[PDB]
Amino acid sequence: SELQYLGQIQHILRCGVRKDDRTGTGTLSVFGMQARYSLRDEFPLLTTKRVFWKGVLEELLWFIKGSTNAKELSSKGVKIWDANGSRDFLDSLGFSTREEGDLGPVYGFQWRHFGAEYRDMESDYSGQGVDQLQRVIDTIKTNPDDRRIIMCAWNPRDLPLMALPPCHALCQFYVVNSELSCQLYQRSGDMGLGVPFNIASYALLTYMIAHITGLKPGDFIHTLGDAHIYLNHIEPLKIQLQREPRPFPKLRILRKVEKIDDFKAEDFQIEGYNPHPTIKMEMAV
Amino acid sequence: SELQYLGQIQHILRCGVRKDDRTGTGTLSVFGMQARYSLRDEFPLLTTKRVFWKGVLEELLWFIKGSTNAKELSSKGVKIWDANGSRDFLDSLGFSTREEGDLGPVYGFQWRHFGAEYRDMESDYSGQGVDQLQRVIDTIKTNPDDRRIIMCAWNPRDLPLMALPPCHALCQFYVVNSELSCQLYQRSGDMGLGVPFNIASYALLTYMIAHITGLKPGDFIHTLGDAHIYLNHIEPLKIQLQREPRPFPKLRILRKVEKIDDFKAEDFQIEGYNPHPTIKMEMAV
Numbered sequence A, B: 001s002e003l004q005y006l007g008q009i010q011h012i013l014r015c016g017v018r019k020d021d022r023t024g025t026g027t028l029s030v031f032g033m034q035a036r037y038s039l040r041d042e043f044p045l046l047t048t049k050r051v052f053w054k055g056v057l058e059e060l061l062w063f064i065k066g067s068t069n070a071k072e073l074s075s076k077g078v079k080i081w082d083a084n085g086s087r088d089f090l091d092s093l094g095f096s097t098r099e100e101g102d103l104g105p106v107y108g109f110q111w112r113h114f115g116a117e118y119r120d121m122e123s124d125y126s127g128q129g130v131d132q133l134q135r136v137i138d139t140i141k142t143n144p145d146d147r148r149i150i151m152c153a154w155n156p157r158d159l160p161l162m163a164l165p166p167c168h169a170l171c172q173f174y175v176v177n178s179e180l181s182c183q184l185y186q187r188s189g190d191m192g193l194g195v196p197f198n199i200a201s202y203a204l205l206t207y208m209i210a211h212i213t214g215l216k217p218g219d220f221i222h223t224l225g226d227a228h229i230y231l232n233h234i235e236p237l238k239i240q241l242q243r244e245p246r247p248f249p250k251l252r253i254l255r256k257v258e259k260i261d262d263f264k265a266e267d268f269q270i271e272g273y274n275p276h277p278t279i280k281m282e283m284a285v
C-alpha cells in the first residue's frame, strides 16, 4: 500500500506542472489527489526511507497537550518547529513581540481551544474555546454513526497570528463495523519531506483514538490540495523511487489508557520497522 | 615505556619536516616509527598528561558493539566524534542525505561486518559481512600459532562513504608462551591528541581479548605511518616534554566475562593512575 505514495511521487514528476511558491525554491505541483492507507494490523510508516518516528510521536503528544511553545517540543529532541519559531523567521512576518517559540495559535491550540482569544504561548486556556479533540472522542463513544465527527484547525480569525497556517487543516472520523477510519484534508503537501511525516502522524492519531473508544483502526484516507515536489528534492526522491518497499511495521499499545491526555511516549512501540536508509531533504523556509 | 612516546615527540620536534595537511593547520611530520609498550602488570595510560580514560573505555565498547552512530557515543559523555559527525562536516563531503552523526562504515562497522553493504547507522547488520573481531578470538583459541590473526578496517570499497577513513587501519595479534601481543599500524598519528588515546585504546582491547582467551597481555607494538605534530600543538607538547613520567597504572577486570560483547563499562577499573594536569590541545578535523 506504500506504492500509493510512490505513485503520487511518480505522477508529479511525470505530469506535474512547474509552479512558483512563497519560498525562494521551486515546485512541480498537482492539485487534488487521494490515497488510502490501511491501518488494519499494520502501521503506514514508510519503508522506502526511514521516517522520524520519535518526531511523529513527540509532536502529536505536543499537539494533544495543547502547547504552542516550540521550546516545549524542542526539549524532547524534535526541533522541526524551531525554524518557524525563530526570531529570523518570526520578525520577517511582523511577529516582533514573541518570546521564544511563539508559533501563535497553531495545531495544538486549535485542537483544544478553538475560538478562544490567544494571548501568548504560556497563558492558560483551560475551559476556553471548543475542545474539538475531546468532543470527537465523546461523539464516537455515544453516536458513532454521526457524520459530523470533525476536528478542524483552519481558523481564519487566528490565521494572521500563526507563524505558518495549518497544512493539515481538517480531518474527519468515521465508524462502521467497530472500525475507526480517518480522512485528512491537507491543503499543502510537501511530498518529499512533510507528507510521510503527516501520514504517520494522523495514522498514530487514529490508533490512539481507537484505543480509547475501544475500536479497531480501519483506513486512513490522505486527501491533498496542492501536492508539490520541491525542485531540490528531485534527485533524493528519484533515489527513493528506485527502492523496493518492504512490509509495513506494526504499532503496539503497551497499556490500557482511559483518557487522551494520559498517553506517554513509553506507551507506544513500533515492532518490525526495517526501512531503507534515511534521505535527508532540505526544508524550504 | 612512556619515555618512548616522549622520545617520539622529541624526535619529531627536532628532526621532523614541515608539511601541509587536509585541515590546513600544518604539521611537523615523520614517516615510519615503531614503539613497544609492555602490557605485563602495567597499562599504557600516559601520565605526562591526563588521558580521557572514559572516552577510551566507551569508544572501544562502541567499536565492539559495531555502532557507527556518533550520537550513541555522545549520549555516553564522549563527544570525540561529534565534530566529524556534524551537519556542517557531513555536507562538506557530499553526504547531504545522511542523518546528523552518521559516520558511515567506520571502525565499528568493519570490525563486525566487513564487506557488508552499509545502509545507515540504524540498520541491522547481524549476520552480514565478516566478523573479524570474533574470528580473531576464535583463531587465538584454536590456532594460536597462526600468523594471520588480523583485523583490518581499511576498506577501499567502503572508503568514499566514511566521514573519516580509519587511522588505526590494521592490527595484528600474536601468541607465544601464553602471551597475547598486538601490533597496530596507524597510517596517521596525531601525536599530541590521538596517539596517546590510541595507545590506551588498543592496549585495552588486548587486555579484553586476552581475558576471553585465557592469555596474559604481552606487548603492544605501536607502528606509525604519518606521525605528525600539529603547529598549534608545539608549545603544549614542549610543556609536556619537561614533565617527568610517573609509573603506569594497572588494569583490573572485576568479573570473568566469556564473550567480547558482554563487556560493560563497569567491569574495568584503572588502579593507580596519577597523571599530570590536563593539557588541552585543539583538534584539527
Ligand SMILES: Nc1nc2[nH]cc(Cc3ccc(C(=O)N[C@H](CCC(=O)O)C(=O)O)cc3)c2c(=O)[nH]1
Residues within 6 Å of the ligand: A050, A051, A052, A055, A080, A084, A164, A190, A192, A193, A194, A195, A196, A197, A198, A283, A284, A285
Ligand atoms: N517546506 C516545508 N516547510 C515545513 N515547515 C514545517 C513543516 C513540517 C515538517 C517539518 C520538518 C520535518 C522534518 O524535519 N522531518 C524529518 C522526518 C520527516 C520524514 O521522514 O518524512 C525529520 O525530522 O528528520 C517534518 C515535517 C514543513 C514541511 O514539511 N515542509
Ligand SMILES: Nc1nc2[nH]cc(Cc3ccc(C(=O)N[C@H](CCC(=O)O)C(=O)O)cc3)c2c(=O)[nH]1
Residues within 6 Å of the ligand: B049, B050, B051, B052, B055, B080, B081, B084, B164, B190, B193, B194, B195, B196, B197, B283, B284, B285
Ligand atoms: N585531528 C584529529 N581528528 C580526529 N578525528 C577523530 C579523532 C579521534 C579522536 C578525537 C578526539 C580525541 C580527543 O579529544 N581526545 C582527548 C582525550 C585524550 C587526552 O586527553 O589526551 C579529549 O577528550 O580531550 C581523541 C581522539 C581525531 C584525532 O585524534 N585527531
Ligand SMILES: O=c1ccn([C@H]2C[C@H](O)[C@@H](COP(=O)(O)O)O2)c(=O)[nH]1
Residues within 6 Å of the ligand: A022, A164, A165, A167, A168, A188, A189, A190, A191, A194, A195, A198
Ligand atoms: O504538516 C505539514 C506542515 C507543512 N508542510 C509544508 C507544505 C508547504 O510546502 C510548507 C508550508 O508552506 P505553504 O503551503 O503554507 O506556503 O510546509 C507539509 O507538507 N506538512
Ligand SMILES: O=c1ccn([C@H]2C[C@H](O)[C@@H](COP(=O)(O)O)O2)c(=O)[nH]1
Residues within 6 Å of the ligand: B021, B022, B023, B164, B165, B167, B168, B187, B188, B189, B190, B191, B193, B194, B195, B198, B284, B285
Ligand atoms: O584514532 C585516531 C583518529 C584520528 N587521528 C588523527 C590523525 C590526523 O591528524 C587526523 C585526520 O586524519 P587524516 O585523514 O588527515 O590522515 O586524525 C588519530 O591520530 N587517531
